[PDB]
Write a protein that binds this ligand. Structure first.
Ligand SMILES: Nc1ncnc2c1ncn2[C@@H]1O[C@H](CSCC[C@H](N)C(=O)O)[C@@H](O)[C@H]1O
Ligand SMILES: Nc1ncnc2c1ncn2[C@@H]1O[C@H](CSCC[C@H](N)C(=O)O)[C@@H](O)[C@H]1O
Ligand SMILES: CN(C(=O)c1ccc(Br)s1)C(c1ccccc1)c1ccccc1
Ligand SMILES: CN(C(=O)c1ccc(Br)s1)C(c1ccccc1)c1ccccc1
Lengths: 321, 321
C-alpha cells in the first residue's frame, strides 16, 4: 500500500535545487571524502549515499528505518556499488557499525515533529559514530522570518465579493467568515510564496551548528529569538513566513541550500503564520517580536509574540500534529 | 475550525460550469417555478435556493444539516430574501415542512459514500415532500466508462529512467516499484483527464430516472451494466475513467451538465480505475466488461470484470472509505 512512499521520494528527487545542492555540496568535499568512510542517516532511495561514492568514499553505510530501504538495496546493487555502499535497515539509534566514520550526510530538514526527531537521530549518530572533528553534510542550519502579504490568500478572501459580478447573487457578507476560517486557526500552513509577498528584509532568528555538543540539551529549551524590521510599502500584512537554509562546507567557500521565497522553489516551500485578521502596514512601519520553536499529545509548538506599528503586542501560538 | 468548510464551498462556487448549469437549468423552468414552492436539499451557502427565487418561486425551503447553514442564513438575509427563502437547519429526513412542494433542487452528485447517501436523502425527500408529477432538478443522471491512457501517470512511471540524464545515477530499476505503488492499489483515484487520454468511444453503463419509485429498492442491488468498445490507436492503457452527467428538463430541449474529459473541466474531474499494470492496445482492440457500483466497514465497492484484446477476463474490485 506504498503510493505515499513513492510520492515523497519522487517529490525530493524531482527537486533539482535540493538534489543538485547535495550533489555539489558532497562533490566539493571530494578531498576529505576520497578513501574515507561515510554514514548516510535516512538514506531513503540511496541517492545521497551514491553521491558520496561518486565523491570517492571507500565505504558508505546507508541506514534507512522505513520500507524504502529495499528500493535503496535494489538501486545500489543495480549501480554495481554493493561492495562500497552497505544499506542497513532499521533506526540509526540501534545500528551496529564496525568502525567510527569520517563523515555523516543527512536530509533531516522540514516542518513538523518527523523533522525535529530526524535531527535528534542525526545528533545521536554524530555523538555515537562520528570521529573527533568529523565532517557533517550539511554542517549548519539558519532560520529566517519576515512579514508577508499572501496574494493567493488575498484572492481567496475577496472571492466572495466577485460572485455578484458573475452569478447575480451578493455573497460579500461571507468575507468575515472566510477570514475567521482561513486566518483564525492555529495551524502552520506550508505554502510557496514569491518575492513580491515579502514586506521587509528577512531577519535570521536562529543558527544551529550541528558540530556543537549540548546542542541536544539546548534544543530542550527550544530554538528561537527576537526580530525587528521595517516594511517597504503599503500592504495588507497576513502574518509571517519562516524558512531555513543549510550550509555544506567547501573544498572553496561554503555552499548554501536556501528555501527562501527570493530563491528558486523547493518541495519545502515556506512555513506561514497567519494573524487572526489582516493588518494594513505602510512604508517604515516597525514589525518586531519573538519566536520560539519547541516540542510538547506529542506536538511541535510555535510561540509568537509580535508588535505591528502603534498596535499593542499580541501572542499567537501555533502547533503541528 | 472551519477552513475545510470554506475550501469546499469556494471550489463549488468557483466551478462556473457547475454554477451556470444550475443557474440556467433552474431559470429555464421559470414557467413551472414562478409563484410555486421549492425544497433545496443541502442548500450549502444557499446559492441554488436564491436561483430558485430569481426564477420566481414564491417560497423556497433551504435545508442544510451542517454548520454552513448559518452562512446560508446570513446570505439570504443580506440579499433581502428571508420573506421568500427559509433556511432550516438539520437533516431533510426529519425537517417539518408546512406544505408539500412543487419542485426539489439538489447538488448530491460526486464520488464516495457521502454522495451515495446524499442521493438517498434526495429520494427520501421526493417520496415524502414532492407532489405527484413534481419537478426534480436535476431529473436524471447517466454514467459513462472508457479505456484511458493517463499522461500524468505515464510521466510518473518514466521519471525513474530520467534520473541518469540529470544526476548521473541509474534508478530505472524502480519502474517496477512505482507501477506496483501507483497502479497496484484498490483505490478510486479522482483526477482530471483530457480528451487525448481517451482510447475509445465512451459507453453509457447506467441511467437513473430520479422520478421513478423503486429506484431506492433498485439501488440495493447496485447500479451498473455491460460495456464494449474498440480502441482508436496504439497506446499503453492504464485502466478506465468513469464520469456522470445530469439533466435539467427544459422550458425547450433539456440542459446537460457533463463531467466528461471532452467537456470543460469541473471540480468533480473523473474517477480513475487503474489496472495493476499497463497493457498495450492497438487500433480496433476490443475492450469489454461489467461494472457494478454498490455500498458495503461502511464502504462503496466498485466491481469490475473486464477483457482487453486476446488477454483473459480479469476482475479488479475497488473501494472508497
Ligand atoms: N532514526 C532513523 N534511522 C534511520 N532512518 C530514519 C530514521 N528516521 C527517519 N528515517 C528515514 O529517513 C528518511 C527521510 S527522507 C530521506 C531522503 C534521502 N536522503 C533521499 O535522498 O531520498 C525516510 O526514508 C525515513 O524513513
Ligand atoms: N440529509 C441531509 N439533509 C440536509 N443537508 C444535507 C444532508 N446531507 C448532506 N447535506 C448537506 O448538503 C450539502 C452538500 S454540498 C451543497 C451544495 C449547495 N447546493 C451549494 O450550492 O453550495 C452539505 O452542505 C451537506 O452538509
Ligand atoms: C523541525 N523543525 C520544524 O519543524 C520547524 C521549522 C520552522 C518551523 Br515554523 S517548525 C525545526 C526545528 C528543529 C529542531 C528543534 C525545533 C525546531 C527546523 C530547524 C531547522 C531547519 C528546519 C526545521
Ligand atoms: C455516489 N456515487 C459514487 O460514489 C460513484 C460514481 C461513480 C463511481 Br466509480 S463511484 C454514484 C452512485 C450513486 C448511487 C448508488 C451507487 C453509486 C453516483 C451516481 C450518479 C452520479 C454520481 C455518482
Amino acid at each position: 500500500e506504498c503510493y505515499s512512499d513513492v510520492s515523497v521520494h519522487e517529490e525530493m528527487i524531482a527537486d533539482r535545487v535540493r538534489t543538485d545542492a547535495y550533489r555539489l555540496g558532497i562533490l566539493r568535499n571530494w578531498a576529505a571524502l576520497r578513501g574515507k568512510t561515510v554514514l548516510d542517516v535516512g538514506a531513503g532511495t540511496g541517492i545521497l549515499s551514491i553521491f558520496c561514492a561518486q565523491a570517492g568514499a571507500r565505504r558508505v553505510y546507508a541506514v534507512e528505518a522505513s520500507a524504502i530501504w529495499q528500493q535503496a538495496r535494489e538501486v545500489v546493487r543495480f549501480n554495481g556499488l554493493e561492495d562500497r555502499v552497505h544499506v542497513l535497515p532499521g533506526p540509526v539509534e540501534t545500528v551496529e557499525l564496525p568502525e567510527q566514520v569520517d563523515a555523516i550526510v543527512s536530509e533531516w530538514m522540514g516542518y513538523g515533529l518527523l523533522h525535529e526527531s530526524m535531527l535528534s537521530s542525526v545528533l545521536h549518530a554524530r555523538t555515537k559514530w562520528l570521529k573527533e572533528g568529523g565532517l557533517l553534510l550539511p554542517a549548519s542550519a539558519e532560520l529566517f522570518i519576515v512579514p508577508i502579504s499572501d496574494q493567493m490568500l488575498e484572492w481567496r478572501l475577496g472571492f466572495w465579493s466577485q460572485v455578484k459580478q458573475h452569478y447575480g447573487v451578493d455573497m460579500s457578507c461571507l468575507e468575515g467568515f472566510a477570514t475567521r476560517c482561513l486566518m483564525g486557526h492555529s495551524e502552520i500552513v506550508v505554502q510557496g510564496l514569491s518575492g513580491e509577498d515579502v514586506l521587509a528584509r528577512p531577519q535570521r532568528f536562529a543558527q544551529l551548528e550541528l558540530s556543537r555538543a549540548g546542542l541536544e540539551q539546548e534544543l530542550e529549551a527550544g530554538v528561537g529569538g527576537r526580530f525587528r524590521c521595517s516594511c517597504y510599502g503599503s500592504a495588507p500584512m497576513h502574518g509571517f513566513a519562516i524558512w531555513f537554509q543549510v550550509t555544506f562546507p567547501g573544498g572553496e567557500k561554503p555552499l548554501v541550500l536556501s528555501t527562501s521565497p527570493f530563491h528558486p522553489a523547493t518541495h519545502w516551500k515556506q512555513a506561514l503564520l497567519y494573524l487572526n485578521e489582516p493588518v494594513q502596514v505602510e512604508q517604515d512601519t516597525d514589525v518586531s517580536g519573538e519566536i520560539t520553536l519547541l516540542p510538547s499529545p506529542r506536538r511541535l509548538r510555535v510561540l509568537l509574540r509580535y508588535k505591528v506599528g502603534d498596535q499593542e503586542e499580541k501572542t499567537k501560538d501555533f502547533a503541528m500534529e
